[PDB]
Amino acid sequence: QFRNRVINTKSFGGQCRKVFSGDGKDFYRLSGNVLSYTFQVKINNDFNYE
Amino acid sequence: NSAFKQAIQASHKKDSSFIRIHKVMKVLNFTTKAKDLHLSDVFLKALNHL
Ligand SMILES: *[C@@H]1O[C@H](CO)[C@@H](O[C@@H]2O[C@H](CO)[C@@H](O)[C@H](O)[C@H]2NC(C)=O)[C@H](O)[C@H]1NC(C)=O
């Protein structure tokens, strides 16, 4: 199970760290401290008939 | 008086089909400048903390 909030993910640190999500086609503000956050997609399909 | 007739018919049919595709598209390419690269503030922080 995922559990409760432990890290503050939205301390911007006085930075204006815009990222443009090419997926959502929108700008988001990253925190000042997160190392990376990126929006490239993978899709995996497994399909079985018996 | 003895009379006997027999007829037997059997058919067996088997089909196997397979397909694989691997298709790869390039739409953007780039080259970085050699010098004066503006490092991320997170990276600068990491380095200065060293
Ligand atoms: C990006 O890919 C292109 C395509 O191969 C690389 O070189 C180009 O090749 C075409 C086809 O011969 C030429 O018309 C262009 O003049 C070439 N140069 C460019 C800049 O398009 C290119 O070297 C690759 N890298 C970069 C940074 O563009």
Descriptive key words:
part of a larger assembly; 2 chains; A: 50 residues; mainly beta; two-stranded antiparallel ribbon; B: 50 residues; mainly alpha; 1 helix; rod-shaped; binds a molecule of 2 linked components (NAG-NAG); membrane protein; Complement; CD59; MAC
Can you walk me through this structure?
Chain B: It is found in: Secreted; Target cell membrane. The structure is cut from a larger assembly and holds chains A (50 residues) and B (50 residues). By secondary structure, chain A is mainly β. Chain A contains no helices and two strands. In chain A, strands 1-2 form a two-stranded antiparallel sheet. Helices cover 18% and strands 0% of the residues of chain B. Chain B is rod-shaped and about 110 Å long. Classes of the chains: A mainly beta (50), B mainly alpha (50). Chains A and B meet through loops of A and loops of B. The structure holds a molecule of 2 linked components (NAG-NAG).
Present the secondary structure layout.
The structure is cut from a larger assembly and holds chains A (about 50 residues) and B (about 50 residues).
Chain A: E1 18-21, E2 26-29
Antiparallel strand pairs in A: 1-2
Chain B: H1 41-49
The structure holds a molecule of 2 linked components (NAG-NAG).
Quick description:
This is part of a larger assembly, with chains A (50 residues) and B (50 residues). Chain A has 50 residues and is mainly β.
The largest sheet of chain A is: 2 strands, antiparallel
Q: Any ligands, ions or cofactors bound here, and which?
A: a molecule of 2 linked components (NAG-NAG)
Name the overall outline of chain B: rod-shaped
Helix content of chain A: under 10%
Strand content of chain B: under 5%
Write down the secondary-structure element order of chain A.
EE
Strand content of chain A: 15-25%
Largest interface: A-B, 5 and 2 residues
| Rg from Cα of chain B | 37 Å
**Termini of chain A, distance in Å?**
33 Å
Total number of strands of chain A: 2
SSE ordering of chain B: H
Total of DSSP H or I helical runs spanning 4+ residues of chain A = 0
Radius of gyration of chain A: 17 Å
